[PDB]
Design a protein around this nucleic acid. Sequence first.
RNA 1: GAAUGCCGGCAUGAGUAACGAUAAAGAGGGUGAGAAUCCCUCUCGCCGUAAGCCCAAGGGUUCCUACGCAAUGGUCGUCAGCGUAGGGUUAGGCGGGACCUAAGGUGAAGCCGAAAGGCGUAGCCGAAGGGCAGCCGGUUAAUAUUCCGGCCCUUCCCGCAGGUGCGAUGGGGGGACGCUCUAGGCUAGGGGGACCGGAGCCAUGGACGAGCCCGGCCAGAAGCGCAGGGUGGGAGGUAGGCAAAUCCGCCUCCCAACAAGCUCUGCGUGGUGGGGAAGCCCGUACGGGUGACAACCCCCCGAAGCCAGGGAGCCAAGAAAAGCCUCUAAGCACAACCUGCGGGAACCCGUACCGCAAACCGACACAGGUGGGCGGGUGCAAGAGCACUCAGGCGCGCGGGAGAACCCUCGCCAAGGAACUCUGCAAGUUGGCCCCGUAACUUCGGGAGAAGGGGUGCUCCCUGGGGUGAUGAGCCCCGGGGAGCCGCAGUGAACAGGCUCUGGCGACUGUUUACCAAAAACACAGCUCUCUGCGAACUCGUAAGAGGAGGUAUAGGGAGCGACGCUUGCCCGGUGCCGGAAGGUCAAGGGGAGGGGUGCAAGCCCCGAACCGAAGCCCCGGUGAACGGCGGCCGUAACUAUAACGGUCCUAAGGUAGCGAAAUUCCUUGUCGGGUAAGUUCCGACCUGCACGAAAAGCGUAACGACCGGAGCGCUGUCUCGGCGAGGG
RNA 2: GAGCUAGCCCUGGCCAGGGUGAAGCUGGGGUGAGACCCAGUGGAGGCCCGAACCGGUGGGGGAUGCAAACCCCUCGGAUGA
RNA 3: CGGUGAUUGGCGCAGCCUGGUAGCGCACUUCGUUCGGGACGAAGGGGUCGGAGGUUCGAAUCCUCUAUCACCGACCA
RNA 4: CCGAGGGUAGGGCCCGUGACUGGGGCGAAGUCGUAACAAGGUAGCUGUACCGGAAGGUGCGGCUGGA
RNA 5: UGGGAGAGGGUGGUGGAAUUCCCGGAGUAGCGGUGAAAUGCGCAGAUACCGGGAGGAACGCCGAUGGCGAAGGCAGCCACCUGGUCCACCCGUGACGCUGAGGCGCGAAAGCGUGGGGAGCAAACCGGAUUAGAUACCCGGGUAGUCCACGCCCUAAACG
Lengths: 47, 272
Amino acid sequence: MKRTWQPNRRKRAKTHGFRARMRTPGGRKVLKRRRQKGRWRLTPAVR
Amino acid sequence: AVKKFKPYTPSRRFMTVADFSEITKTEPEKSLVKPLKKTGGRNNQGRITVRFRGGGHKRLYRIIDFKRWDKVGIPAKVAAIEYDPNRSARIALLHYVDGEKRYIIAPDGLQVGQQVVAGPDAPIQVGNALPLRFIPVGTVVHAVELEPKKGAKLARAAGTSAQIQGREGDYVILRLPSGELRKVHGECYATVGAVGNADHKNIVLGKAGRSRWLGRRPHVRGAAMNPVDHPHGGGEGRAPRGRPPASPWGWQTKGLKTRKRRKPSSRFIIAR
RNA sequence: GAAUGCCGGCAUGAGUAACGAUAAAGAGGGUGAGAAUCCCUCUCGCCGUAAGCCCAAGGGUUCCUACGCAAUGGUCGUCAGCGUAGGGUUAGGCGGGACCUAAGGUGAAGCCGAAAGGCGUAGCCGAAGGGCAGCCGGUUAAUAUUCCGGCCCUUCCCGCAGGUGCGAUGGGGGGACGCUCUAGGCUAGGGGGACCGGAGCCAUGGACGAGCCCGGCCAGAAGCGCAGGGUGGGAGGUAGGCAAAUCCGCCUCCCAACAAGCUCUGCGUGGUGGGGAAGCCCGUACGGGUGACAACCCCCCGAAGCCAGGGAGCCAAGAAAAGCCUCUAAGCACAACCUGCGGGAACCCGUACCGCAAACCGACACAGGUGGGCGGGUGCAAGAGCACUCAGGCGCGCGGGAGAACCCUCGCCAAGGAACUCUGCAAGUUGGCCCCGUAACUUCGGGAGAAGGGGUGCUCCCUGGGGUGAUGAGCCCCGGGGAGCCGCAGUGAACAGGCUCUGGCGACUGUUUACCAAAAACACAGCUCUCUGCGAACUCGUAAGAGGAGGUAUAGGGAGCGACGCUUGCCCGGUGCCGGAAGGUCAAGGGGAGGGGUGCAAGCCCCGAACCGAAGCCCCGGUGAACGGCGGCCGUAACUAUAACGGUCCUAAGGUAGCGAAAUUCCUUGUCGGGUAAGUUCCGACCUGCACGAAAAGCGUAACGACCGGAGCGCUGUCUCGGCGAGGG
RNA sequence: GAGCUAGCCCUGGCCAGGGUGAAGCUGGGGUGAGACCCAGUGGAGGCCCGAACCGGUGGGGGAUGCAAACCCCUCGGAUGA
RNA sequence: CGGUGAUUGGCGCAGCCUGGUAGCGCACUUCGUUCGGGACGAAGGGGUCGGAGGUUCGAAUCCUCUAUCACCGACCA
RNA sequence: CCGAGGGUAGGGCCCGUGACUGGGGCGAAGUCGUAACAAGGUAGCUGUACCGGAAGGUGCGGCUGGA
RNA sequence: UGGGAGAGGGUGGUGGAAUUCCCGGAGUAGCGGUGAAAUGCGCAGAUACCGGGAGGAACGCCGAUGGCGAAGGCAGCCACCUGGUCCACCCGUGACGCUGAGGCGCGAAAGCGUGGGGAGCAAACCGGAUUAGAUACCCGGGUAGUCCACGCCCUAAACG
Ligand SMILES: [Mg+2]
Ligand SMILES: [Mg+2]
Ligand SMILES: [Mg+2]
Ligand SMILES: [Mg+2]
Ligand SMILES: [Mg+2]
Ligand SMILES: [Mg+2]
Ligand SMILES: [Mg+2]
Ligand SMILES: [Mg+2]
Ligand SMILES: [Mg+2]
Ligand SMILES: [Mg+2]
Ligand SMILES: [Mg+2]
Ligand SMILES: [Mg+2]
Ligand SMILES: [Mg+2]
Ligand SMILES: [Mg+2]
Ligand SMILES: [Mg+2]
Ligand SMILES: [Mg+2]
Ligand SMILES: [Mg+2]
Ligand SMILES: [Mg+2]
Ligand SMILES: [Mg+2]
Ligand SMILES: [Mg+2]
Ligand SMILES: [Mg+2]
Ligand SMILES: [Mg+2]
Ligand SMILES: [Mg+2]
Ligand SMILES: [Mg+2]
Ligand SMILES: [Mg+2]
Ligand SMILES: [Mg+2]
Ligand SMILES: [Mg+2]
Ligand SMILES: [Mg+2]
Ligand SMILES: [Mg+2]
Ligand SMILES: [Mg+2]
Ligand SMILES: [Mg+2]
Ligand SMILES: [Mg+2]
Ligand SMILES: [Mg+2]
Ligand SMILES: [Mg+2]
Ligand SMILES: [Mg+2]
Ligand SMILES: [Mg+2]
Ligand SMILES: [Mg+2]
Ligand SMILES: [Mg+2]
Ligand SMILES: [Mg+2]
Ligand SMILES: [Mg+2]
Ligand SMILES: [Mg+2]
Ligand SMILES: [Mg+2]
Ligand SMILES: [Mg+2]
Ligand SMILES: [Mg+2]
Ligand SMILES: [Mg+2]
Ligand SMILES: [Mg+2]
Ligand SMILES: [Mg+2]
Ligand SMILES: [Mg+2]
Ligand SMILES: [Mg+2]
Ligand SMILES: [Mg+2]
Ligand SMILES: [Mg+2]
Ligand SMILES: [Mg+2]
Ligand SMILES: [Mg+2]
Ligand SMILES: [Mg+2]
Ligand SMILES: [Mg+2]
Ligand SMILES: [Mg+2]
Ligand SMILES: [Mg+2]
Ligand SMILES: [Mg+2]
Ligand SMILES: [Mg+2]
Ligand SMILES: [Mg+2]
Ligand SMILES: [Mg+2]
Ligand SMILES: [Mg+2]
Ligand SMILES: [Mg+2]
Ligand SMILES: [Mg+2]
Ligand SMILES: [Mg+2]
Ligand SMILES: [Mg+2]
Ligand SMILES: [Mg+2]
Ligand SMILES: [Mg+2]
Ligand SMILES: [Mg+2]
Ligand SMILES: [Mg+2]
Ligand SMILES: [Mg+2]
Ligand SMILES: [Mg+2]
Ligand SMILES: [Mg+2]
Ligand SMILES: [Mg+2]
Ligand SMILES: [Mg+2]
Ligand SMILES: [Mg+2]
Ligand SMILES: [Mg+2]
Ligand SMILES: [Mg+2]
Ligand SMILES: [Mg+2]
Ligand SMILES: [Mg+2]
Ligand SMILES: [Mg+2]
Ligand SMILES: [Mg+2]
Ligand SMILES: [Mg+2]
Ligand SMILES: [Mg+2]
Ligand SMILES: [Mg+2]
Ligand SMILES: [Mg+2]
Ligand SMILES: [Mg+2]
Ligand SMILES: [Mg+2]
Ligand SMILES: [Mg+2]
Ligand SMILES: [Mg+2]
Ligand SMILES: [Mg+2]
Ligand SMILES: [Mg+2]
Ligand SMILES: [Mg+2]
Ligand SMILES: [Mg+2]
Ligand SMILES: [Mg+2]
Ligand SMILES: [Mg+2]
Ligand SMILES: [Mg+2]
Ligand SMILES: [Mg+2]
Ligand SMILES: [Mg+2]
Ligand SMILES: [Mg+2]
Ligand SMILES: [Mg+2]
Ligand SMILES: [Mg+2]
Ligand SMILES: [Mg+2]
Ligand SMILES: [Mg+2]
Ligand SMILES: [Mg+2]
Ligand SMILES: [Mg+2]
Ligand SMILES: [Mg+2]
Ligand SMILES: [Mg+2]
Ligand SMILES: [Mg+2]
Ligand SMILES: [Mg+2]
Ligand SMILES: [Mg+2]
Ligand SMILES: [Mg+2]
Ligand SMILES: [Mg+2]
Ligand SMILES: [Mg+2]
Ligand SMILES: [Mg+2]
Ligand SMILES: [Mg+2]
Ligand SMILES: [Mg+2]
Ligand SMILES: [Mg+2]
Ligand SMILES: [Mg+2]
Ligand SMILES: [Mg+2]
Ligand SMILES: [Mg+2]
Ligand SMILES: [Mg+2]
Ligand SMILES: [Mg+2]
Ligand SMILES: [Mg+2]
Ligand SMILES: [Mg+2]
Ligand SMILES: [Mg+2]
Ligand SMILES: [Mg+2]
Ligand SMILES: [Mg+2]
Ligand SMILES: [Mg+2]
Ligand SMILES: [Mg+2]
Ligand SMILES: [Mg+2]
Ligand SMILES: [Mg+2]
Ligand SMILES: [Mg+2]
Ligand SMILES: [Mg+2]
Ligand SMILES: [Mg+2]
Ligand SMILES: [Mg+2]
Ligand SMILES: [Mg+2]
Ligand SMILES: [Mg+2]
Ligand SMILES: [Mg+2]
Ligand SMILES: [Mg+2]
Ligand SMILES: [Mg+2]
């Protein structure tokens, strides 16, 4: 049947996007933890 | 002049639509100081507040002049009686000699091509507006302001009417449609006559779809729930409420008055 | 040495299950070291409202070419959607952005919050919505509405030429809109043709014949022609459209009432440009040439597409802003704007390929899911249904044999038809169209397709209507009558209801436990109670704020009942709610009688009784479509039996109407009556109601139901009671 | 974390083909005027039959499956909640 | 089988928990009223307190066990 | 072709019958009460509605078959 | 032609007496009720009184053996719309007339449906008396109804 994953570049970039994280204070702590850990992709890759 | 339907299918033997013979041939609307974008919304910023709202047909808000002190002493010609989906009652288009086109809540007995004037002179004929202190005692009236220079906020449903019963000082006492006797300031404005479309009470919706077309979602009973969602909910089959009948939030719904006791407007009310 | 311990490796099942839809394959010839699996040819089968094309989302090299097979491919593999390398995506007109706004987000002003943060008018962002200027062919191995060819348009900027008061993010118009049913004329699309153009062909008995087969188009400026949409034209007056207007709006007489006239679309026709089958010849995977100087003609059907903002009806009453036109404002009127022409300027991004699927979501080359457009022909009443078939694309990436049991999926059967069984579960009968004919009951609509019947193919003759053609031929669509023929059978194949009686529950259409329950559960119109006079009541939030509602007692909220018909009886003792400026109790505070601690004292510091002290509770009433409840024991009547009657105890009052062995009855298969040969089920009664009962509603109710129970008819592999055959294992 | 699912807001699209013939109009009848009755027109409906589409009633298969909800037959809604 | 409530004049209930007195109403009987009966008026009788045992100076009364009677429960399988 | 009649299917009328139930009448001198006839001890009667073991009571309006 | 009477009918408007309730003043130990009583109301300030306000229903005197109407029935006043009827003049028509199966219309009160309104009265119902018992008669309460609009119901001691 209709599974869970139905991609959308608009939705992906707007929810897990870099700008969306810098809006909220909780999202700013997400990137701080990703920088400290050393993730290569601080945000999900969207094209 | 309520219309009936033959029972060719069910929910049509009881289905009932209102009469539109009073509506003159003005099915569309006027514009520019006339319909505004109606913001359809069943809720506030986020969560739902007033439940079981949504769906329904799309509407256009006809802006109604509820403050007729803008055009004191200026006559008017009634050229149209239109349908308003946002109101139970009917509206009336008014062409001004001054040139402005406004909508007034159409009262009873008003006919197309009638001279209507607002202000303190304003002789007593249907549709005219006056301060409460100049209207004779015993006459029916509607579109009454509560406080002066604030807008008509009283008796503007369908078929409703307020009656004046006397003058006390700067205030006058009014027989509201709920039977309440209220002191209203004499400088408040009110348009005389009843509002008409009194057959609105006699409408039968017929089927469930009509309620959905008006935007009224289905109403779920509390006893048909679970105790997490409702105090009446729960129990094995058909519990007989097991407690005083209350609302989902705990407050009783059978005779519990909830008017604020220390309201400053309490020294202006007399009856129920 | 153990912890169903952790990590890694290797055993067992076992050469077993499986190899991913039963749409199907066979042969020949090539390449090759190696061919069922690669290429080509012939034959066969499958899809064909797709299993064929075109977009969007998604994917990111998968597209092409060359060289290859270690791994991926459920086998092989010379093949690839795989490895290596190279090549391939060209835009003023397609789509998005230098245009617009909606939900929503953001948000200077401003409001709020310990902090982080939360609202929020104007503005901005926000798109398959509105606005905007390209059609047809040809080329690549891979791109084209992008390159090329033809024809045609849109913005700017600079100029001469001619006109006008020019002129804004400001005002007005317009943009601008629902659902259903539709008129006229076109186009797309399709059918036929004795007419036109064609390589060819008479096979096997017959046919040189209006014989067979293939094809008879596309685009196209400015005009014309045909449809159609929008709109009156003057004159005054004017306080409104938040400054001003000659504009708009509102009055007043004049001319039209029309589309006459202005524009604006759509379709022909148009300068001219392009395409061009079948068959044959070939050298490739794929295409080229000829056929051809190709013809490019006439009828008929005809749209849901165009004319579009068409017309009519109806209630549930159906976006905003910009582009565009007009108007004036400052400023300017050597500027500027409008028309025409000429020259010049016209950017960023996407364009490959899959795209109902082996390239997207399902860990897979997964029988699943996935939005929009075209989707032909014939026949079946019609149709996107069903059968076959064009174009096009496939034979589903293991095969070859054998012909056990048994499993799945099918076909058939004597005689009996439900005797099987929880129950006709399942399978079977019926099945489309036309015409007869159709009960109880009923809300007069229905029940109805009730039920049950008859016709259904083909040939010939006569005959009635339309549409397009001129009133005619032809072509197309409907009929009617008569005479015949054949088969077992004529919706001859495929698609296509079994029917009835009765009861329970629910009024119904509908919704729900994705993933065991679709129901008698929920919802539903309708009824009632209650709250709420607006800064409403209620809800979210600490607040601001917002919903309610830009609503106003015919309105909004909460609760229960659940169309409709008849009804909904008694109890306020307790609880809930409502109403009572008396009284009792009652906290902080006031109040200080009086007492205590220190001081040599003035003093300072503690308690501390009367008395005044709110809500609430106690108290007084009311209130059932509020929470809730609605008795026990004795005796008594011309035979027993029974109790209309009475006595007594108790409660606040003691179940009325209407139902009742019921979705409720333990004893119970209560006892009669009916259906049966036989009925713990079903139906109709009696009432001895363990333990019905009136809005957690009661009793009925036409219609309605993949609900539940009982019965009958038809039919049958359900059964006696099995048997045989087919295919996938 | 509402790219599944539930609800709502904004904006678009989809629902082949057949039946039934409500209201209302025209004419006739009827009356004093009516009510009302006949046809013809008309095309209303949480209307019927039945494809796309949305489901998921019953049975069979499936059970380390094609599939962590499937397949075959059958069945419901299909202009509206 | 379990728990707990009561057997009291002919009948229906008080009297018990705080032991020394058995009462109310109907009924029955006598008299009165009426032509008579019912109703009414005036007076009167009526109880081994279900039986057995002790607890005491003393039991309808306090406590055990049987006898029926009424009511409730017997659940998860 | 028609055709007596036979068969299938569905309607209409009538009759017999049926657990049980309603009301009617007649019976042995039964039980309960007093409705109405006298102003019948609440004047009576009536249409209608409600209620009550029952005659009946009451409400609205009417009649003299009463003052 | 010209006069006349009348509660004849429909609509709209309007007056006051009286009842109930609300408010203020004043004022006390009882008020109601009956045959007698009781329920009930009342120091929480009743009845009785004054003043003001709201609301509904019916119109005293005139007024009766009266009047009108086909019947049921119709009663404050005003206006409008309207029917029937009587008299005089003897003016015109000129037998047009009577009854009336059906049908049609009207039709007290009670009753039903929808909405409104509800002061008093009042079935049902709740108490308090009486009785042996009282579901009645009497008393205190009290819901439908009584009133309005529309649509039904078609009954009667609709009786002269
Ligand atoms: Mg605008
Ligand atoms: Mg607008
Ligand atoms: Mg918001
Ligand atoms: Mg938010
Ligand atoms: Mg109502
Ligand atoms: Mg509900
Ligand atoms: Mg539940
Ligand atoms: Mg919740
Ligand atoms: Mg929850
Ligand atoms: Mg709770
Ligand atoms: Mg229960
Ligand atoms: Mg409960
Ligand atoms: Mg080890
Ligand atoms: Mg060990
Ligand atoms: Mg294990
Ligand atoms: Mg083990
Ligand atoms: Mg092994
Ligand atoms: Mg093997
Ligand atoms: Mg084995
Ligand atoms: Mg195998
Ligand atoms: Mg495979
Ligand atoms: Mg070779
Ligand atoms: Mg893409
Ligand atoms: Mg391999
Ligand atoms: Mg695989
Ligand atoms: Mg090779
Ligand atoms: Mg390839
Ligand atoms: Mg490659
Ligand atoms: Mg932009
Ligand atoms: Mg914008
Ligand atoms: Mg906005
Ligand atoms: Mg913000
Ligand atoms: Mg801050
Ligand atoms: Mg905003
Ligand atoms: Mg667009
Ligand atoms: Mg464009
Ligand atoms: Mg070009
Ligand atoms: Mg200008
Ligand atoms: Mg504008
Ligand atoms: Mg063409
Ligand atoms: Mg052709
Ligand atoms: Mg030829
Ligand atoms: Mg031959
Ligand atoms: Mg101005
Ligand atoms: Mg015209
Ligand atoms: Mg052309
Ligand atoms: Mg042209
Ligand atoms: Mg060619
Ligand atoms: Mg070729
Ligand atoms: Mg045509
Ligand atoms: Mg139109
Ligand atoms: Mg703008
Ligand atoms: Mg491309
Ligand atoms: Mg492409
Ligand atoms: Mg598709
Ligand atoms: Mg992938
Ligand atoms: Mg994959
Ligand atoms: Mg494969
Ligand atoms: Mg797949
Ligand atoms: Mg689909
Ligand atoms: Mg199509
Ligand atoms: Mg088609
Ligand atoms: Mg086809
Ligand atoms: Mg056809
Ligand atoms: Mg057909
Ligand atoms: Mg098909
Ligand atoms: Mg083919
Ligand atoms: Mg396969
Ligand atoms: Mg055979
Ligand atoms: Mg057989
Ligand atoms: Mg046989
Ligand atoms: Mg048989
Ligand atoms: Mg059976
Ligand atoms: Mg059997
Ligand atoms: Mg058997
Ligand atoms: Mg079956
Ligand atoms: Mg039936
Ligand atoms: Mg049939
Ligand atoms: Mg035949
Ligand atoms: Mg069918
Ligand atoms: Mg049945
Ligand atoms: Mg049934
Ligand atoms: Mg149902
Ligand atoms: Mg389920
Ligand atoms: Mg579902
Ligand atoms: Mg589950
Ligand atoms: Mg109802
Ligand atoms: Mg809060
Ligand atoms: Mg607000
Ligand atoms: Mg709002
Ligand atoms: Mg409500
Ligand atoms: Mg319920
Ligand atoms: Mg009570
Ligand atoms: Mg109470
Ligand atoms: Mg009480
Ligand atoms: Mg209180
Ligand atoms: Mg103190
Ligand atoms: Mg104190
Ligand atoms: Mg103190
Ligand atoms: Mg207090
Ligand atoms: Mg009740
Ligand atoms: Mg005896
Ligand atoms: Mg039984
Ligand atoms: Mg039975
Ligand atoms: Mg029971
Ligand atoms: Mg029997
Ligand atoms: Mg028998
Ligand atoms: Mg039997
Ligand atoms: Mg019984
Ligand atoms: Mg019940
Ligand atoms: Mg109840
Ligand atoms: Mg029910
Ligand atoms: Mg029933
Ligand atoms: Mg029912
Ligand atoms: Mg029924
Ligand atoms: Mg259903
Ligand atoms: Mg059965
Ligand atoms: Mg076999
Ligand atoms: Mg076989
Ligand atoms: Mg969603
Ligand atoms: Mg259709
Ligand atoms: Mg008609
Ligand atoms: Mg339907
Ligand atoms: Mg259907
Ligand atoms: Mg489609
Ligand atoms: Mg199911
Ligand atoms: Mg249906
Ligand atoms: Mg258990
Ligand atoms: Mg008597
Ligand atoms: Mg008497
Ligand atoms: Mg009497
Ligand atoms: Mg009574
Ligand atoms: Mg009387
Ligand atoms: Mg003469
Ligand atoms: Mg006569
Ligand atoms: Mg009557
Ligand atoms: Mg009446
Ligand atoms: Mg009434
Ligand atoms: Mg009274
Ligand atoms: Mg009384
Ligand atoms: Mg009389």
